[PDB]
Amino acid sequence: MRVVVIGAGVIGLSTALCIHERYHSVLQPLDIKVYADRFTPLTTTDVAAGLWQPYLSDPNNPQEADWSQQTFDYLLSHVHSPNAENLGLFLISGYNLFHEAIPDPSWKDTVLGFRKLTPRELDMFPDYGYGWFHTSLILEGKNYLQWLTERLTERGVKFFQRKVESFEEVAREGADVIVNCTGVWAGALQRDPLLQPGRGQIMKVDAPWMKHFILTHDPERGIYNSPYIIPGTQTVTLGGIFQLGNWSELNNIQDHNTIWEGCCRLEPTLKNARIIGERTGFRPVRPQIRLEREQLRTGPSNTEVIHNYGHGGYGLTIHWGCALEAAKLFGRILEEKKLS
Amino acid sequence: MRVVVIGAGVIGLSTALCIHERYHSVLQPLDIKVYADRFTPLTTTDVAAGLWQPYLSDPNNPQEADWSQQTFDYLLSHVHSPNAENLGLFLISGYNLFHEAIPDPSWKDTVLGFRKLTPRELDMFPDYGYGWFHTSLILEGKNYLQWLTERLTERGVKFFQRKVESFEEVAREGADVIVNCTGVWAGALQRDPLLQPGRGQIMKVDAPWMKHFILTHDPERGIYNSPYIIPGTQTVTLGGIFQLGNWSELNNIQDHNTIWEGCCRLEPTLKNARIIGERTGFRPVRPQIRLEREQLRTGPSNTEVIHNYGHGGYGLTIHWGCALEAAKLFGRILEEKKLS
Ligand SMILES: Cc1cc2nc3c(=O)[nH]c(=O)nc-3n(C[C@H](O)[C@H](O)[C@H](O)COP(=O)(O)OP(=O)(O)OC[C@H]3O[C@@H](n4cnc5c(N)ncnc54)[C@H](O)[C@@H]3O)c2cc1C
Numbered sequence: 001m002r003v004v005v006i007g008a009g010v011i012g013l014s015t016a017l018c019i020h021e022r023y024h025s026v027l028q029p030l031d032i033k034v035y036a037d038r039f040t041p042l043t044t045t046d047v048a049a050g051l052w053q054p055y056l057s058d059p060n061n062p063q064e065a066d067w068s069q070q071t072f073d074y075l076l077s078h079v080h081s082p083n084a085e086n087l088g089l090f091l092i093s094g095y096n097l098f099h100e101a102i103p104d105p106s107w108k109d110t111v112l113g114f115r116k117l118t119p120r121e122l123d124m125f126p127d128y129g130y131g132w133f134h135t136s137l138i139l140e141g142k143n144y145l146q147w148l149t150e151r152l153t154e155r156g157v158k159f160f161q162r163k164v165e166s167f168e169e170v171a172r173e174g175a176d177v178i179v180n181c182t183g184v185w186a187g188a189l190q191r192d193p194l195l196q197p198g199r200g201q202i203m204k205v206d207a208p209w210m211k212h213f214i215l216t217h218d219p220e221r222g223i224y225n226s227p228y229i230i231p232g233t234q235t236v237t238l239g240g241i242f243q244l245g246n247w248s249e250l251n252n253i254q255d256h257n258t259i260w261e262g263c264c265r266l267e268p269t270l271k272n273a274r275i276i277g278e279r280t281g282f283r284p285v286r287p288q289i290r291l292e293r294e295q296l297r298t299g300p301s302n303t304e305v306i307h308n309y310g311h312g313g314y315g316l317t318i319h320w321g322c323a324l325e326a327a328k329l330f331g332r333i334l335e336e337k338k339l340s
Numbered sequence: 341m342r343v344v345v346i347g348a349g350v351i352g353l354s355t356a357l358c359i360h361e362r363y364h365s366v367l368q369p370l371d372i373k374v375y376a377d378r379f380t381p382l383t384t385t386d387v388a389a390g391l392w393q394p395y396l397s398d399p400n401n402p403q404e405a406d407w408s409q410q411t412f413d414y415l416l417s418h419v420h421s422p423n424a425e426n427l428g429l430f431l432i433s434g435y436n437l438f439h440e441a442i443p444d445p446s447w448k449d450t451v452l453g454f455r456k457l458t459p460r461e462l463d464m465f466p467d468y469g470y471g472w473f474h475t476s477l478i479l480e481g482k483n484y485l486q487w488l489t490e491r492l493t494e495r496g497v498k499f500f501q502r503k504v505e506s507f508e509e510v511a512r513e514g515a516d517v518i519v520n521c522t523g524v525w526a527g528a529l530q531r532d533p534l535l536q537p538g539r540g541q542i543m544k545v546d547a548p549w550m551k552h553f554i555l556t557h558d559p560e561r562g563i564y565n566s567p568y569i570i571p572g573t574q575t576v577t578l579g580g581i582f583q584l585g586n587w588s589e590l591n592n593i594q595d596h597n598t599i600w601e602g603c604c605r606l607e608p609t610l611k612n613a614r615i616i617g618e619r620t621g622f623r624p625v626r627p628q629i630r631l632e633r634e635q636l637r638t639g640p641s642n643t644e645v646i647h648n649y650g651h652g653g654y655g656l657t658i659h660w661g662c663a664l665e666a667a668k669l670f671g672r673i674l675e676e677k678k679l680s
């Protein structure tokens with residue numbers, strides 16, 4: 001009963017934990033190893049603000065809306081716990097700004113107190129003429145990743161610093177089940193032309209008077225490419241850079257400018273806020289998440305592979321529902337093998 | 341014209357600013373001095389969290405609701421102003437929690453996006469069965485008082501550290517108009533049987549993940565005597581203590597425990613918060629604010645006095661509408677001295 005999880009971002013970590021809680025037994029022990037090239041604070045998960053917000057429009061797969069709703073409901077149950085702070089979990093309200101009356105999102109009833117913005121509220125954002133206000137949740141990846149690791153290490157899970165070259169390399173060493181949570185890099189283990197980097201740049205600023213998230217939406221700039229302000233526990237994330245096919249890990253100076261000028265125009269009080277840091281990450285962009293089983297067609301034994309990658313700009317938002325689905329796929333592997 | 345403003349809390353400073361910006365001219369040159377025994381951070385204004393919220397039910401004087409509304413409208417028009425950070429001015433959303441249903445407040449349309457709490461939002465507060473959600477403003481005194489002081493200084497207003505023994509002592513040194521903004525200590529200059537300290541105690545805690553205010557209402561505890569959580573710029577104010585007639589300036593453990601126990605039950609995450617500081621202050625409690633002119637008959641001349649005190653637990657909420665009214669009374673004085 002040897003299981004190897006490839007990846008230590010929110011995907012692999014929550015998957016490892018979910019499989020362990022649901023399938024570990026002293027009767028039938030479950031050996032679980034996590035192999036990863038990069039760990040916290042150096043994953044894509046660490047670059048995220050951690051705000052819960054799926055895409056505005058209905059997903060290519062309606063199963064994704066269920067996975068996001070299951071994640072919200074799960075995080076909402078731990079929000080008023082003493083453990084909440086160790087997770088990087090907290091409630092936050094905020095604004096979604098538009099230039100037109102776009103349709104209501106499928107998640108209007110999952111979030112708390114969703115409503116349209118009133119005239120006086122919109123008078124605060126002269127560049128926008130429609131929007132929403134609701135209460136959502138922030139799950140900060142750097143705390144959540146450390147918390148998941150702590151809970152994994154105490155459940156018997158060993159962590160290994162390694163760049164996996166092939167699934168067959170892992171299959172050869174005895175892995176019965178391979179959990180593929182490689183994010184944006186998955187194409188290195190198996191070609192997937194639907195998987196692309198969604199290059200992102202963010203600024204971390206000191207603006208503690210900022211109690212609300214502010215997200216803007218422009219068709220001319222596209223998804224995740226217009227100003228956003230997201231207050232964290234210690235700092236405020238400034239963003240709004242999406243570049244499909246861009247693999248540059250360096251901080252582009254025109255992007256730094258776009259972030260600064262766009263966010264200051266959105267919220268003039270940012271102009272006097274102290275810039276703390278700047279980061280680049282690659283969103284694992286895909287028309288839909290890949291969350292399925294694959295029987296390896298290489299080597300003398302067939303190896304069971306659970307793929308869990310391609311969560312684009314909403315991995316923190318959907319991680320739990322995806323972890324639970326991967327655990328379901330895992331139990332299906334267990335039954336098909338044998339009972340007695 | 342020689343003006344002496346007694347008091348350097350929010351009332352004294354905003355009145356002095358409002359009078360100077362409206363009346364100092366070539367036609368009416370004003371010599372304004374401010375006398376105060378205590379300056380920031382040692383005034384009642386400094387103990388306050390600075391949240392804008394008047395009384396729920398219609399005031400004894402309907403003028404008070406107009407004065408609070410004028411204050412919110414003025415502060416709201418500056419929320420994105422270059423000076424907002426210097427003022428300590430920012431937007432904040434939050435909860436007003438009740439055991440039973442209560443009528444909508446007279447200010448429901450002054451605040452932003454006022455509405456009732458939904459069942460899912462109410463499930464987060466088991467001890468309460470009814471509530472509101474709205475967006476208001478915080479104006480922090482430690483910043484606001486220093487901002488008003490800098491504004492008065494550039495206008496040529498002179499500040500003196502002194503404990504005024506009597507209005508006559510001021511009148512005898514040449515004051516034409518005395519603006520009495522002495523807060524809870526006004527009785528020492530002229531007996532006021534309707535003025536009492538509304539003793540308050542607060543804790544300032546490090547809980548930066550707290551993004552909303554939470555105010556609880558209990559008619560058995562009375563006004564300002566039920567737990568409240570008010571996130572500021574650097575710290576979160578924990579309070580909920582009102583002791584009518586208590587002149588003790590010391591912080592006490594009983595009140596420390598009431599605050600801590602009450603606010604931790606409301607928000608379990610507070611258990612792990614670091615306590616930064618604790619303060620005691622005296623709300624200037626009266627059945628209504630005394631904002632009126634008086635011709636003082638103590639000495640060879642009559643001195644024109646403007647009283648502006650008795651703002652209770654809502655001095656920050658109402659200060660600007662009161663400062664504008666004091667200025668109108670000041671104009672009536674100049675108009676009588678046959679020089680306007
Ligand atoms: C700028 C920006 C802002 C964002 N904001 C939000 C937000 O507010 N809310 C939200 O829900 N989402 C947000 N996201 C998306 C979120 O960051 C990602 O969807 C989530 O981090 C992807 O999770 P992951 O586990 O798949 O990838 P990662 O965190 O990238 O983990 C991939 C893991 O796979 C490992 N790995 C890959 N290949 C191999 C190999 N061959 N061998 C060994 N290890 C390997 C890596 O080392 C790493 O451990 C944001 C993204 C960006 C870029």
Ligand SMILES: Cc1cc2nc3c(=O)[nH]c(=O)nc-3n(C[C@H](O)[C@H](O)[C@H](O)COP(=O)(O)OP(=O)(O)OC[C@H]3O[C@@H](n4cnc5c(N)ncnc54)[C@H](O)[C@@H]3O)c2cc1C
Pocket residue numbers: 346347348349350351352375376377378379383384385386387388389390391392393502503504505521522523524525526528529538539540541542579620621622623624649650651652653654655656657658
């Ligand atoms: C615990 C607590 C929390 C609160 N929270 C809020 C809130 O969130 N929002 C809100 O709107 N309000 C709040 N308040 C109300 C606000 O603090 C007071 O209404 C406002 O501070 C009253 O201001 P003031 O100018 O009249 O008095 P103060 O701020 O006390 O200043 C009185 C001034 O007069 C001076 N003075 C008095 N007598 C003399 C004399 N004889 N000679 C020389 N100088 C003299 C003092 O030295 C001082 O400079 C709160 C109050 C308390 C106690």
Ligand SMILES: O=C(O)c1cc2sccc2[nH]1
Pocket residue numbers: 049051052053054200215224228230239240283312313314317
């Ligand atoms: O840039 C992103 O990928 C991103 C910004 C926000 S705000 C909520 C989710 C999310 N994702």
Ligand SMILES: O=C(O)c1cc2sccc2[nH]1
Pocket residue numbers: 391392393394540555564568579580581623652653654657
């Ligand atoms: O304790 C007080 O006097 C007080 C608490 C709050 S919250 C808004 C006003 C106000 N006043």
